[PDB]
Amino acid sequence: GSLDGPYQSTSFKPPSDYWILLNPTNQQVVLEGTNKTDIWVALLLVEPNVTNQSRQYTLFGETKQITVENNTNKWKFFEMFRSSVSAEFQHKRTLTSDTKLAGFLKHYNSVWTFHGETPHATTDYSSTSNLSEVETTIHVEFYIIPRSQESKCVEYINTGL
Ligand SMILES: CC(=O)N[C@H]1[C@H](O[C@H]2[C@@H](O)[C@@H](CO)O[C@@H](O[C@H]3[C@H](O)[C@@H](O)[C@H](O)O[C@@H]3CO)[C@@H]2O)O[C@H](CO)[C@@H](O)[C@@H]1O[C@@H]1O[C@H](CO)[C@H](O)[C@H](O)[C@H]1O[C@@H]1O[C@@H](C)[C@@H](O)[C@@H](O)[C@@H]1O
């Protein structure tokens, strides 16, 4: 079949009903997304077998010190989240993965991401009253997949390109 992409790293407002399939190599911050009203979401990537490692990540213009741990042989995407500009970032969800792929979707009233552990990763959401204004800074090569082909995106997440 066909897959729309790759697109190079960039900043833009993805249309609703299209998955962004993220394809990092060694980037530390993979994606930043915000509408500046009730959604701030960032995905951090941590390699296998890391214990208590203090690292630096810049999120939405704010350079942060975050200590990370990954005691598995798989990679981990950490989903960092907050609902207002002056709040602390909290670790909201995790995706444990041997494919190194993650996703981002705007649909209906929510932003969707993947969580869990491959090859059985699943989707979950954060709701918003201002979906249309969510802009994503994507730090990696990426692909676009229509929501009508979400099952293909799930396959990629779980077993790879
Ligand atoms: C059950 C389902 O369809 N889940 C999919 C989810 O659907 C959202 C939409 O239906 C949306 C309306 O367009 O409503 C969302 O629910 C709202 C509530 O109505 C609202 O009150 C509350 O405040 O906010 C929630 C969240 O917005 C539905 O959740 O869309 C997801 C994003 O595309 C999609 O991932 C999810 O798909 C299901 O995922 C689970 C595992 O997470 C399983 O794989 C299911 O098999 C899968 O559903 C299947 O694919 C979807 C795309 C659709 O074709 C289904 O018919 C199909 O069974």
Residue numbers in the entry: 63 to 223
Q: What do the paper's sentences say?
A:
The P VP8* in our X-ray crystallography and NMR studies is from the neonate-specific HRV vaccine strain RV3. To understand how the VP8* of neonate-specific P HRV recognizes type I glycans, we determined the structure of P VP8* with H-type I pentasaccharide (also known as Lacto-N-fucopentaose I or LNFP1) at the resolution of 1.8 Å. Distinct from the HBGA binding sites in P and P HRVs or the Sia-binding site in ARVs, the H-type I glycan binding site consists of one of the β-sheets and the C-terminal α-helix of P VP8*. The residues L167, W174, T184, T185, R209, and E212 are involved either in hydrophobic interactions or in a network of direct or water-mediated hydrogen bond interactions with type I precursor Galβ1,3-GlcNAc at the non-reducing end. The Gal4 moiety interacts with R209 and H169 via hydrophobic and hydrogen bonding interactions, and also in hydrophobic interactions with Y170 and W174. The reducing end of the H-type I glycan is further stabilized through a set of interactions between the Glc5 moiety with the residues H169, N171, S172, W174, and Y187. In the complex structures, the sidechains of Y170 and N171 change orientation to engage in a hydrophobic interaction with Gal4 and a hydrogen bond interaction with Glc5 of the glycan, respectively. In addition, the side chain of R209, that forms a hydrogen bond with E212 in the apo structure, binds to GlcNAc via hydrogen bond and hydrophobic interactions in the structure of P VP8*/H-type I complex. As a result of the rotational changes in the glycosidic bond in the neonate-specific P VP8*, the reducing end of the glycan is brought closer to VP8* establishing a number of hydrophobic interactions involving Y170, N171, and Y187 and hydrogen bond interactions involving N171 and S172. Remarkably in the neonatal P VP8*, a single residue H169, which is well conserved in most neonate-specific [P6] genotypes, alters the conformation of the glycan to sterically restrict branching at the reducing end.
RV is a non-enveloped double-stranded RNA (dsRNA) virus with three concentric capsid layers encapsidating eleven dsRNA segments. The outermost layer contains the glycoprotein VP7 and the protease-sensitive spike protein VP4, which define the classification of RVs into G and P genotypes, respectively. RVs use the VP8* domain of the spike protein VP4 to recognize specific host glycans in a genotype-dependent manner. Our studies show that VP8* of these genotypes engages the type I precursor glycan (Galβ1,3-GlcNAc) at a unique and conserved binding site that is present in all P, P and P HRVs, and the subtle sequence and structural changes lead to an altered glycan configuration at the reducing end in the neonate-specific P RV, that may play a key role in the age-restricted tropism of some P strains.
